[PDB]
Design a protein around this nucleic acid. Structure first.
Ligand SMILES: [Mg+2]
Ligand SMILES: [Mg+2]
Ligand SMILES: [Mg+2]
Ligand SMILES: [Mg+2]
Ligand SMILES: [Mg+2]
Ligand SMILES: [Mg+2]
Ligand SMILES: [Mg+2]
Ligand SMILES: [Mg+2]
Ligand SMILES: [Mg+2]
Ligand SMILES: [Mg+2]
Ligand SMILES: [Mg+2]
Ligand SMILES: [Mg+2]
Ligand SMILES: [Mg+2]
Ligand SMILES: [Mg+2]
Ligand SMILES: [Mg+2]
Ligand SMILES: [Mg+2]
Ligand SMILES: [Mg+2]
Ligand SMILES: [Mg+2]
Ligand SMILES: [Mg+2]
Ligand SMILES: [Mg+2]
Ligand SMILES: [Mg+2]
Ligand SMILES: [Mg+2]
Ligand SMILES: [Mg+2]
Ligand SMILES: [Mg+2]
Ligand SMILES: [Mg+2]
Ligand SMILES: [Mg+2]
Ligand SMILES: [Mg+2]
Ligand SMILES: [Mg+2]
Ligand SMILES: [Mg+2]
Ligand SMILES: [Mg+2]
Ligand SMILES: [Mg+2]
Ligand SMILES: [Mg+2]
Ligand SMILES: [Mg+2]
Ligand SMILES: [Mg+2]
Ligand SMILES: [Mg+2]
Ligand SMILES: [Mg+2]
Ligand SMILES: [Mg+2]
Ligand SMILES: [Mg+2]
Ligand SMILES: [Mg+2]
Ligand SMILES: [Mg+2]
Ligand SMILES: [Mg+2]
Ligand SMILES: [Mg+2]
Ligand SMILES: [Mg+2]
Ligand SMILES: [Mg+2]
Ligand SMILES: [Mg+2]
Ligand SMILES: [Mg+2]
Ligand SMILES: [Mg+2]
Ligand SMILES: [Mg+2]
Lengths: 85, 80, 205, 81
RNA sequence: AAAUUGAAGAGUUUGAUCAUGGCUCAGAUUGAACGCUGGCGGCAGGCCUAACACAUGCAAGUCGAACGGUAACAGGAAGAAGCUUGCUUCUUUGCUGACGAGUGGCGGACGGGUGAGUAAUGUCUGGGAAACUGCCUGAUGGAGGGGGAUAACUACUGGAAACGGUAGCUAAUACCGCAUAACGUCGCAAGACCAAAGAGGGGGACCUUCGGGCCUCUUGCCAUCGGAUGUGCCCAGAUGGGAUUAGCUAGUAGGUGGGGUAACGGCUCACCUAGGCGACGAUCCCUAGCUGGUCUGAGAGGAUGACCAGCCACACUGGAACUGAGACACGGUCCAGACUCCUACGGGAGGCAGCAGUGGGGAAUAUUGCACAAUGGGCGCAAGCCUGAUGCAGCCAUGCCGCGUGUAUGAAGAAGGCCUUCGGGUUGUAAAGUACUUUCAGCGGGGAGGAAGGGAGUAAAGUUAAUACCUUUGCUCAUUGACGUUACCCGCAGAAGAAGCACCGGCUAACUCCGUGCCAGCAGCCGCGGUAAUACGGAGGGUGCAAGCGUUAAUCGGAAUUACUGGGCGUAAAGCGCACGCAGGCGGUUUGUUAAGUCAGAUGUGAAAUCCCCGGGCUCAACCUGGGAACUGCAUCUGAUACUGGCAA
């Protein structure tokens, strides 16, 4: 790093990396909850996990960590898998 | 008024798909002679309504697989 | 560049007069025009088709003062222009500023006209020209400048021009030291001793 | 930003600008979309130094193409006639 | 109207001739190199080899109109000032102009360089759908109320350094909830859910806790639908050589169902089919960035892709990922390896295939120059800052173009040299002499243009309660050029400071003499030289070019000597030893129909630049530039049906 702008962006891309990783893990936790409740055979716990997960995913998409096209795919796939029970 | 191509069918062993041996009449750039440079493709065959040695008409659609980019619209001259 | 060597030598080599001198005296009275220069003169050279084409091209080059690099460009321009390539080359050569000055009579020799143009004693349409190869356009006016309008050489040039034949395509007013280029010269208005067909065949070899 | 600017050409000490519409990312004398008029700052009299296409420039200014200071000055000058 | 107008051969096989056939040459070019010489100017060009290794200086910074803060500086309200009774001290004081450092927004993925790799994941042409898109712009709306902490800072402390660690406080357009939910997401629907940030300027009192409330203007923020631009993906054709590379492929071809990307897709996974490519060249090997274009060639063609422009790949080597709208990122971050550097020996730093510049390689390619004064780019409301992009300067005859190194007279045909038959001739109007001119270079002086804008004001309109602030329109004022001692113009004196190279037997234009003797030597081919050499070396003379002239390397032409245009196979080289025959190539005659090839028109595109035509401007030209033609092509549509082909009789 020979530029002060590069030195500053080096830690700007690390603090942001930590925050984005934390938020991504938080969202993937609820995604895993929904996916684990789907195959168990229940239709109420999976639906409750879907309602717990959807606002978080929508908020992350609005903030820009993920894309609304990915959020829609996740929601549609989870709803399609739930509706088959 | 949709761009389509017509050609024979060579293979139907693949599941829900066929191949088309498109034939044309191309003039040689140097010697000025007309030749027949064929072109092979992979065409989606939903319902398997085709056969070997049959004439088919195809249409360019979204890529269904790695080698698929065309789909058929009808079948004509179902010769056996 | 320019040729600074003898001129009667080139005239003898070409076998005819090339009008590189003032013309006060004759050619025989100044040199031996019938004898080629060098120890091996006094015998008529026996040349081939390539030799005669080269001599025909060199005669024009030495008459007009042009070199090979500037004459090949003129030939290319003549070939590019529509019509007779040989006539267009002659018209372009006659359109040179020094040639126009020589024809009008403001210079006794074409070399003198070139020197005047270089030394900036000639203006075209009120604007001075410092190039001896300026291409003259129809309806142009070439006049002598006031700083050099009182030259004994510049008046003896007119005194010799009046003795010489007058150009039809030009006009001149000796009192005002001015001339007008009316039209582009034609083939009939030039000399008949130049076979221009020997230059096209030489350059297309 | 898609912009309208002046790409420079010609010999040294005798420049000649062409008013072209191009992306600001691209280079000056590099890539462009449309060429609209020219400009010769050293042009003499009885010789046009501006042949801008006002209709075409407006077609891009209505889509979002911004105008540089020199382009705006040339537009004002050509409108002052 | 014009956009083209375009074709040379010669020498050598043989006692001699014809034919076939091989070799060489005259020609045009280069990012060229070497020898000799060397006046100037203008526009262009300048590591083709070691993608070899780099010392040194710059190349990406900006914003106080985002927020805490004043480490420097100047302007201070106040007071501690030596007192001179105003001031050349100096604590304190961020209140002011501004600002080191830091948080934060933006920019870093553009601009610039290289062509190692890639023969196809690349490039060109023409079609598309299954996608995204900051800054730009149009429309519809919203923009409510809260919080916990981190820097900078303080104290301590580790380490040689680089670089950190601990305890504590504070700010926002940083962060997170949270409030609402639409033409947004999900789904058949019902219904569920996701957003914000404020900042600056000026004012009348209704208010003020005296900071500001409240009004207006500007700017800024969030959601959606759009537009333009840019980016990603797919198909068809075209884009090198080798068959002494004939068999390749098991995530391989496809399908079903999950997962995944902004998006389709074996992109990935689990299972099921045994398929898929290939003689129209799969696979493998070697070389190579591609195109617009350039050279040659009249033309089809051949060679090539330097400088200008577009596309792709890369940044010491091999891989990786994050932030980010947009990189798997030249001057961003990890890790491994080689090469250097610092070291207190525990440990750390670096990547010129950026602009100059160093060493080495090679035949060889330049100055650690000035400037942001223009056009752009980044930041900023703007002023303004940075910019080795760019505009310019320096070197090089490397290429193109232009000018000059004087013009006229001047026979006693001066002198001298050379030749000679000894009469003479050549150098030779050439020199000298005589009158004149002074372009270029030098001296002096004058002097455009590249400059449009910006700032300070003023008047009007818009604007609002508002003659306030702000935008626009005009007008006035002092200005903003590295080039630059500019281009350009006028006087000074004086021909003064300015011509060389190659060749002279034929091809090919240009001959005599002297030294030599198959010795020295020339050479592109025929060849020359063995005592009169126009061929070796020198002199005189002559020829061709010209500040260039010769030599060498490469391409094309001539080479109709790879012949599609444009050739041959009885005897020069060329008919398989002969038959059958698959694929393939071609195909008798009539009608009807389809209209694929073909033929006509139209539309879109075929970037710009380049070639050409008609013009225009640098004192002409080179050079630049306006318009047009052209880019022979491709896709679609409208038709024609004579021929080939598809179908029927
Ligand atoms: Mg580091
Ligand atoms: Mg020259
Ligand atoms: Mg013989
Ligand atoms: Mg021959
Ligand atoms: Mg360095
Ligand atoms: Mg600061
Ligand atoms: Mg290249
Ligand atoms: Mg925010
Ligand atoms: Mg909410
Ligand atoms: Mg809020
Ligand atoms: Mg599998
Ligand atoms: Mg799926
Ligand atoms: Mg799938
Ligand atoms: Mg390569
Ligand atoms: Mg030919
Ligand atoms: Mg090529
Ligand atoms: Mg390197
Ligand atoms: Mg790497
Ligand atoms: Mg991201
Ligand atoms: Mg890359
Ligand atoms: Mg970078
Ligand atoms: Mg990198
Ligand atoms: Mg670097
Ligand atoms: Mg360099
Ligand atoms: Mg060196
Ligand atoms: Mg060396
Ligand atoms: Mg600038
Ligand atoms: Mg700097
Ligand atoms: Mg004598
Ligand atoms: Mg001068
Ligand atoms: Mg000026
Ligand atoms: Mg001869
Ligand atoms: Mg010789
Ligand atoms: Mg002898
Ligand atoms: Mg000799
Ligand atoms: Mg001599
Ligand atoms: Mg040929
Ligand atoms: Mg033959
Ligand atoms: Mg024989
Ligand atoms: Mg034979
Ligand atoms: Mg036989
Ligand atoms: Mg027939
Ligand atoms: Mg047809
Ligand atoms: Mg047509
Ligand atoms: Mg002109
Ligand atoms: Mg074009
Ligand atoms: Mg028929
Ligand atoms: Mg047939």
């Amino acid at each position: 790093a020979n530029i002060k702008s590069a030195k500053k962006r080096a830690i700007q891309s690390e603090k942001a990396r930590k925050h984005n990783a934390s938020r991504r893990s938080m969202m993937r936790t609820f995604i895993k909850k929904v996916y684990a409740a789907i195959e168990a055979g229940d239709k109420a716990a999976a639906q409750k996990a879907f309602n717990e997960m959807q606002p978080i995913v929508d908020r992350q998409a609005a903030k820009g960590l993920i894309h609304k096209n990915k959020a829609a795919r996740h929601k549609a796939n989870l709803t399609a898998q739930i509706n088959k029970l | 008024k949709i761009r389509t191509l017509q050609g024979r069918v060579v293979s139907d062993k693949m599941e829900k798909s066929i191949v088309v041996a498109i034939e044309r009449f191309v003039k040689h750039p140097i010697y000025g002679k007309f030749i027949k440079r064929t072109t092979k493709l992979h065409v989606h065959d939903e319902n398997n309504e085709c056969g070997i040695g049959d004439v088919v008409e195809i249409r360019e659609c979204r890529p269904l697989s790695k080698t698929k980019s065309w789909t058929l619209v009808r079948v004509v001259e179902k010769a056996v | 560049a320019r040729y600074l060597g003898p001129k009667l030598k080139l005239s003898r080599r070409e076998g005819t007069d090339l009008f590189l001198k003032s013309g006060v005296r004759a050619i025989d009275t100044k040199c031996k025009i019938e004898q080629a220069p060098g120890q091996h003169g006094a015998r008529k050279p026996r040349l081939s088709d390539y030799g005669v084409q080269l001599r025909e091209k060199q005669k024009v080059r030495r008459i007009y003062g042009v070199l090979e690099r500037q004459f090949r460009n003129y030939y290319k321009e003549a070939a590019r222009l529509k019509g007779n390539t040989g006539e267009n080359l002659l018209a372009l050569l006659e359109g040179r500023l020094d040639n126009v000055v020589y024809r009008m009579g403001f210079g006794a020799t074409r070399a003198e006209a070139r020197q005047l143009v270089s030394h900036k004693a000639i203006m075209v349409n009120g604007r001075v020209v410092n190039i001896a190869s300026y291409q003259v356009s129809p309806n142009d006016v070439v006049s002598i400048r006031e700083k050099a309008k009182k030259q004994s050489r510049v008046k003896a040039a007119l005194e010799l021009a009046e003795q010489r034949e007058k150009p039809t395509w030009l006009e001149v007013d000796a009192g005002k030291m001015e001339g007008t280029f009316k039209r582009k010269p034609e083939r009939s208005d030039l000399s008949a001793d130049i076979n221009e067909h020997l230059i096209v065949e030489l350059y297309s070899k | 930003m898609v912009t309208i600017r002046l790409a420079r050409h010609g010999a040294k000490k005798r420049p000649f600008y062409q008013v072209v519409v191009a992306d600001s990312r691209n280079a000056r004398n590099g890539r462009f979309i449309e060429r609209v008029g020219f400009f010769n700052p050293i042009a003499s009299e009885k010789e046009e130094g501006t042949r801008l296409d006002l209709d075409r420039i407006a077609h891009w200014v209505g889509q979002g193409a911004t105008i540089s200071d020199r382009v705006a000055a040339l537009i004002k000058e050509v409108n002052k006639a």
